[PDB]
Amino acid sequence: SMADEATRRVVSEIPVLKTNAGPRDRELWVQRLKEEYQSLIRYVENNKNADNDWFRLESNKEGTRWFGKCWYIHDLLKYEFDIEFDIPITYPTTAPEIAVPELDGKIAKMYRGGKIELTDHFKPLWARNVPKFGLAHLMALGLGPWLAVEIPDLIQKGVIHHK
Template identity: 60%
Template sequence: MGRGEYRTNDMLSSKWRDMNLKVRKFNGIYSQKWQTRRSGQSDAMIEREEEEQYREEFNAHFSLQRMKAGPRDGADWTQRLKEEYKALIAYTSMNKSKDNDWFRISAANPEGTRWTGKCWYVHNLLKYEFDLQFDIPVTYPATAPELELPQLDGKTHKVLLKSNLDFEYVTMYRGGKICLTVHFKPLWAKNSPRFGIAHALCLGLAPWLAAEIPILVDSGMIKHKDDAVSSSES
């Protein structure tokens, strides 16, 4: 591979475990509701109860998508885009109300198939900001979008786990596409087509940033913009 350095299992911080926390809790509620469903209770009723319980317990808001449509589906895709924007607005408003605003994103073309924006993460009271971009796959919403942080291309670490199993875990692919295979893609597959862009950001990108940015900063792989300016001037 030749990208970055290796971290052994013993070097993994609690940040990595936190990356999966929301996902595990959400999955746990879903499984519990499904297994204890009452006679005559529809799937829609279970979904509403699941969403309400998750919001109450973990202070998260999910506006689930209803239209199963992708970029090739004409008017249905237009309706799906409206639902996507509604969910993004709700999620952004919730973040602002909790003083946890951390991204800006919008469609970069009229078709809504290309999205660009910014995301940021605060570490040690310093704000680290990155370009964010992704394309909507033609197989969306069955397939989750691949979120890209091009400024971090080639800077992330690899995780070499050596315990009962021996395998390599890559946190980013070429081009700055973040790896969400372990903690998010199974959840997306389970909840498609109800999940959308807001869910990819909340349950995919946010925990990835929380797990990776502190490591990249502490290892010197990325620097705060003020430090970078000072270094260039010296």
């Protein structure tokens, strides 16, 4: 399957997650957050080694709200966007909705409040892998390829400018 090989090529060096727990699940949620942090930091370290260090993320104390920054390089200019998301109660079976609030209204593949609209292939891809994928995979398989389509379009249309 081309889809199976493309998924493996993108995520094969990201630690797989294990625990089926969401924000209400107490010691099981603390364990799930250990998996999420170990997977995120390995992905960041890999990204630095590949000259593609393209985001930072932090969470609140309980790990229910995430926020940070992503960067997108176009014609050697670096564009920075603030990102944020809440962890759904039914995570990790349900995928979180990444928002890029400063781009709200400016992109057709986007919902009100700046929540990105991914392709219809993303949801069944996440579903088939539960609970192995986490936030590192959402970034690698969801936001990353969305930016590589939507940011070049906004720059070429003159809707955003370099700051």
